[PDB]
Paper text:
The fusion protein for CoV is its spike (S) protein that decorates the virion surface as an extensive crown (hence, “corona”). The S protein is a heavily glycosylated type I membrane protein anchored in the viral membrane. It is first produced as a precursor that trimerizes and is thought to be cleaved by a furin-like protease into two fragments: the receptor-binding fragment S1 and the fusion fragment S2. To gain further insight, we aimed to determine the pre and post fusion states of full-length wild-type S protein of SARS-CoV-2.
The four domains of the S1 fragment, NTD, RBD, CTD1 and CTD2, wrap around the three-fold axis, covering the S2 fragment underneath. The furin cleavage site at the S1/S2 boundary is in a surface-exposed and disordered loop, so it is unclear whether this structure represents the uncleaved or cleaved trimer, although the sample clearly contains both forms. First, the N terminus in our structure is ordered and adopts a conformation similar to that in SARS-CoV, including a disulfide bond (Cys15-Cys136) and a N-linked glycan at Asn17. Second, another disulfide containing segment (residues 828-853), immediately downstream of the fusion peptide is also absent from the structures of the soluble ectodomain, but ordered in our structure. We designate it as the fusion-peptide proximal region (FPPR). In our full-length structure, it packs rather tightly around an internal disulfide bond between Cys840 and Cys851, further reinforced by a salt bridge between Lys835 and Asp848, as well as by an extensive hydrogen bond network. When compared with the RBD-up conformation by superposition of the rest of S2, the FPPR clashes with CTD1, which rotates outwards with the RBD in the flipping-up transition. Thus, a structured FPPR, abutting the opposite side of CTD1 from the RBD, appears to help clamp down the RBD and stabilize the closed conformation of the S trimer. Our structure of the full-length S protein suggests that CTD1 is a structural relay between RBD and FPPR that can sense the displacement on either side. There appears to be crosstalk between the RBD and the FPPR, mediated by CTD1, as a structured FPPR clamps down the RBD while an RBD-up conformation disorders the FPPR.
Numbering used by the authors:
A (entry chain A): 972 to 1116
B (entry chain A): 293 to 618, 633 to 676, 689 to 728
C (entry chain B): 729 to 1068
D (entry chain C): 972 to 1019
E (entry chain C): 729 to 777
């Protein structure tokens, strides 16, 4: 159009000649709204997916204890606490992280009396001379009974 | 001013944050203009068209082929005095910069009031019954008052027009039939009868006739442009042919910009231009020394500007995609680093791999460091760590760390 | 996981080599820059998608030279060091089963001009301002991340995800994973020879399968094909008139004056600008398809590779034991090991 | 355009003047299909 | 889970029963196709869903 200003067209041109210029602005400004709405519909789907994730993390990280790996942060998930934020949510994930590992010799089974023994819970470990059965995620040895 | 300012321009901001910004594709400007017209030395028959002692009647309108001539229409300014000159496929200003493929001049005389009917898409006895122009008419129509030439004191009846027809004639159709017209429901035979009308009638061109009933001579030039080998051309001198240079070319009026090159394509003689998938003209047959030329545009290759924050520094680096520096560059650099992503200029290549700061692509990131300058490096993925694996060794944690981590979700 | 990055010189596509058109395009303004912001948001997050999936561990673990993994044969999926790119055997099949129109992302003016301006898809694209950008992580860096995940898995089990990589004998690890599916660990040790052989035989069939059947990698080719089709459609749309007397911009400027050309040029700008708006819209929608897929692949990495998923049919049919990632062009392949 | 009815244009205007009016309807009606398809592509992602 | 498949005769919507309109629509070309490629992708994946 001759002008971006709608009124400068109408103050200079009569109905027949203005209709041409105005119809261009309607076409271009209507397209600007169509473009904006398309961007926002696409964008809203990014937010909807993120809000469906945040809702799933609320149900599972907060209202429970998730066995899923790295779903509620790195480490073994203990609990999570939600915190509100502008247009979002913040989860404070509490995780148990193994800290100070030691080397041990290990075996899959033990032969006491001509049989094969396997842990009920835990794993066999030797400290060099003596064999113990311990839980897998924390070194707390016990005599093999 | 420079690639940095280009980003400020594109961002409409005087301060640019840290990052890498895409810019305009690198594009060479044309070095010189080149013009190539078919060489024809003799001028067009302007005198035989616009000065012929006797024009044809409109019902028997003449058609003349104009070929192998130069369209220097300036020659007739002194003596033409056209009352109407209207072009339909071109702007009148462009006729000198343009060539024409097949050119036909249609010459006839009509009443002054009927000159308006010569426009394409008209009605009236002239448009409907002796001379119709097509809707896609490419041509320029020319008419001038001819009372002094064609009019006769006793009235000049040598000029005839068709007053009756069974149907409107087709575009560029010429009807010479004089057979009687049947206005009524009765058949008509012989020569005459009631409601039997002779289809032709004569203009009474007396010089005393009121202006508008005076005779007007009309010449209709119909031509096609830029689609076929040309045979009529404007009065522009051809330049010498240059190749492997960016030039503003003009072939038979086909103006453009790009690099000319010797083609291996083979054109059947009726063809002059080749067109791309994009339908952009990509080849042309030189009109003087017939040899097929390729046309390649000069604008090619991307450009990106690596910058730290404006608040931090005004120094920048430039990345040229589609450029191998082992040049098509804006500037020669003291330090140049060729990357799989492109030729990087203005950044120091360091072997020390850091964490990615500004991603340049294909494994390269860049950063501002020490005396400060932009460094470019292959990004580090992390620490390398061989695990202690043994067929009978196990590691078990003796302790724990409770660790709280914050995760933010829109 | 990702799709091809693209960038468009909005002016060069609409108004190639025409100052008159370039001056008229200014009368639209932000529309050209709005297109580039969208494409940059798409491109910038293709690196994110690849980072979320592969870069889960920031420590490049490497395998020991002594492959005493309890009789399991990972040689077919571990790196093949002597090759120029240190990828595994199976990964080299995946990279051959997906074919891309261009390689190396550098195509100079020399090897593309003149006779080859007519011929090549990419040359037609580049001349009309359409470009394909290189990804941040090369196919070698992707393989190093995949090597770290696979090497960490076999040598440390799931511990390397939850913290520091604690080594554990692989038969001891597989014993943990049998307990995970509710089968007592003694069932592994008393059948280790058969279990190891069945894994080795199962991985063998993977090589034979990918060697034999042509349609296996449909998804990764379908993404490369769609991205190529969208650009090659965009170039063909330069042939449309949109109501102007000509598709060729210059054939208007050489036959019409400034005011009669302005009408004709305005139609081409409107039509060609709409073509970019349409293309960008398709790519924004398409990028959302890929993002969801990359968010799935990232979750399968965390839960099938870095751990052992108790979820049903999340890591294939059967009771999930472990999974091994394999890089593929623009994607990831998970080799899901399941007890059936 | 002078009319929404495609035929009322062609029955009142000759080719050159009809082309202008028809071109507007093609542009607007083609835009309507583009908008519809855009909405359905976004919608199909919700359903997917 | 799924939604109604649709297909559009892009020529018949724009240019129903008009030959003059159809000839002018050809001047746009691939638009008529790009539209139906999208709808086919939508429709075909409803069976996938
Ligand atoms: C591996 O762990 C073993 C168990 O902790 C350990 O053996 C234990 O060693 C302690 C001394 O360090 C002994 O303690 C007893 O020693 C005498 C025995 O009468 C008493 O006077 C002491 O007061 C105390 O009761 C444990 O008896 C002994 N346990 C066994 C089963 O022998 C090994 O030394 C450890 N080996 C390594 C290499 O670290
Ligand atoms: C080009 O020539 C065509 C043939 O000469 C002509 O079509 C002819 O038009 C006449 C007059 O309308 C018709 O004459 C008969 O029409 C019907 C039968 O169709 C009778 O009822 C009438 O009484 C009369 O006898 C011809 O039938 C018709 N011929 C054909 C083959 O259709 C075109 O009109 C001419 N076109 C131009 C632009 O002049
Ligand atoms: C794990 O599986 C590997 C194959 O999946 C296997 O490697 C294979 O070993 C055999 C025998 O050493 C090779 O057979 C060929 O060896 C040389 C190589 O040039 C030839 O001259 C021989 O004639 C024979 O054809 C295979 O080539 C080789 N396969 C591969 C892919 O390298 C390992 O041995 C297996 N590991 C264990 C511990 O058994
Ligand atoms: C265009 C043209 O040829 N015009 C000529 C004119 O210059 C000349 O004076 C006249 C003499 O009869 O004949 C005619
Ligand atoms: C500053 C510095 O140490 N530069 C070195 C360079 O001297 C050497 O040639 C190159 C080998 O790849 O590695 C880097
Ligand atoms: C800009 O840099 C100055 C120091 O030169 C610093 O004080 C200021 O916070 C910075 N502002 C921004 C917006 O980065």
């Amino acid at each position: 159009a001759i002008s971006s200003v709608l009124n400068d067209i109408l103050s200079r041109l009569d109905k027949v000649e203005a209709e041409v210029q105005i119809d261009r602005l309607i076409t271009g400004r209507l397209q600007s709204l169509q473009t904006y709405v398309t961007q926002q519909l696409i964008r809203a789907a990014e937010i909807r997916a993120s809000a469906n994730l945040a809702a799933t993390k609320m149900s599972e990280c907060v209202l429970g204890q998730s066995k899923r790996v790295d779903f509620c942060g790195k480490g073994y998930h203990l609990m999570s606490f939600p915190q509100s934020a502008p247009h979002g949510v913040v989860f404070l994930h509490v995780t148990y992280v193994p800290a100070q590992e030691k080397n041990f010799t290990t075996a899959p089974a033990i032969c006491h009396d001509g049989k094969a023994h396997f842990p009920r819970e835990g794993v066999f470990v030797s400290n060099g001379t003596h064999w113990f059965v311990t839980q897998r995620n924390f070194y707390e040895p016990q005599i093999i009974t | 001013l420079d690639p940095l300012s280009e980003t400020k321009c594109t961002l409409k901001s005087f301060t640019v944050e840290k990052g890498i910004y895409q810019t305009s594709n690198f594009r060479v400007q044309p070095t010189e203009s080149i013009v190539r017209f078919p060489n024809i030395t003799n001028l067009c028959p302007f005198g035989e068209v616009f000065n012929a002692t006797r024009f044809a009647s409109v019902y028997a309108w003449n058609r003349k082929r104009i070929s192998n001539c130069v369209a220097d229409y300036s020659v007739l300014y002194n003596s033409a005095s056209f009352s109407t000159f209207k072009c339909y496929g071109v702007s009148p200003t462009k006729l000198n910069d343009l060539c024409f493929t097949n050119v036909y001049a249609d010459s006839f005389v009509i009443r002054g009031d009927e000159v308006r009917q010569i426009a394409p898409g008209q009605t009236g006895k002239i448009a409907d019954y002796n001379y119709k122009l097509p809707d896609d008419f490419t041509g320029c129509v020319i008419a001038w008052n001819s009372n002094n030439l064609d009019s006769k004191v006793g009235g000049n009846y040598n000029y005839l027009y068709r007053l009756f027809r069974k149907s409107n004639l087709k575009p560029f159709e010429r009807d010479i039939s004089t057979e009687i017209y049947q206005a009524g429901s009765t058949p008509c035979n012989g020569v005459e009868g009631f409601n039997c009308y002779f289809p032709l009638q004569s203009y009474g061109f007396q010089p005393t006739n009121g202006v508008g009933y005076q005779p007007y001579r009309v010449v209709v030039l119909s031509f096609e442009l830029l689609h076929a080998p040309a045979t009529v051309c404007g009065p522009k001198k051809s330049t010498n042919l240059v190749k492997n240079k960016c030039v503003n070319f003009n072939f038979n009026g086909l103006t453009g910009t790009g690099v000319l090159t010797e083609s291996n394509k083979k054109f059947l003689p009726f063809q002059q231009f080749g067109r791309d998938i994009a339908d952009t003209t990509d080849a042309v047959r030189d009109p003087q020394t017939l040899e097929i030329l390729d046309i390649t545009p000069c604008s090619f290759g991307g450009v990106s500007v690596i910058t730290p924050g404006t608040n931090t520094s005004n120094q920048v680096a430039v990345l040229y995609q589609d450029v191998n520096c082992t040049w098509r560059v804006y500037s020669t650099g003291s330090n140049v680093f060729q990357t799989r992503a492109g030729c990087l200029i203005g950044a120091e290549h360091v072997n020390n791999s850091y964490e990615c700061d500004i991603p340049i692509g294909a494994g390269i990131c860049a950063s501002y460091q020490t005396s400060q300058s932009i460094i470019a490096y292959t990004m580090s993925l992390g620490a390398e760590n061989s695990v202690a694996y043994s067929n009978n060794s196990i590691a078990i944690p003796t302790n724990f760390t409770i660790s709280v981590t914050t995760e933010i979700l829109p | 996981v990702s799709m091809t990055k693209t960038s468009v010189d909005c002016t060069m596509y609409i108004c190639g080599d025409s100052t008159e058109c370039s001056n008229l395009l200014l009368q639209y303004g932000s529309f050209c820059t709005q297109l580039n912001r969208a494409l940059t948001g798409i491109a910038v997050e293709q690196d994110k998608n690849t980072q979320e999936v592969f870069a889960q561990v920031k420590q490049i673990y490497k395998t020991p030279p002594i492959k005493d993994f309890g009789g399991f044969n990972f040689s077919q999926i571990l790196p093949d060091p002597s090759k120029p790119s240190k990828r595994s055997f199976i990964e080299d099949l995946l990279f051959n089963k997906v074919t891309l129109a261009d390689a190396g992302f550098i195509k100079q003016y020399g090897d593309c001009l003149g006779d080859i301006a007519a011929r090549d898809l990419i040359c037609a694209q580049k001349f009309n301002g359409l470009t394909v950008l290189p990804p941040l992580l090369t196919d070698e860096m992707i393989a190093q991340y995949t090597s770290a995940l696979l090497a960490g898995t076999i040598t440390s089990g799931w511990t390397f995800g939850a913290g520091a990589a604690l080594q554990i004998p692989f038969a001891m690890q597989m014993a943990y994973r049998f307990n995970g599916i509710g089968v007592t660990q003694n069932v592994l040790y008393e059948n280790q020879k058969l279990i190891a052989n069945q894994f080795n035989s199962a991985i063998g069939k993977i090589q034979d399968s990918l060697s034999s059947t042509a349609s296996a990698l449909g998804k990764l080719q379908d993404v490369v094909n769609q991205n190529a089709q969208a650009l090659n459609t965009l170039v063909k749309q330069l042939s449309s008139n949109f109501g102007a007397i000509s598709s060729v911009l210059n054939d208007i400027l050489s036959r019409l004056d400034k005011v009669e050309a302005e009408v004709q040029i305005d139609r081409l700008i409107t039509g060609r600008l709409q073509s970019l708006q349409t293309y960008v819209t398709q790519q924004l929608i398409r990028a959302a398809e890929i993002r969801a897929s990359a968010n799935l692949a990232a979750t399968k990495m965390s839960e099938c590779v870095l751990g052992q998923s108790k979820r049903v049919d999340f890591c294939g049919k059967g009771y999930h034991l472990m999974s091994f990632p394999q890089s593929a062009p623009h994607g990831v392949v998970f080799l899901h090991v399941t007890y059936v």
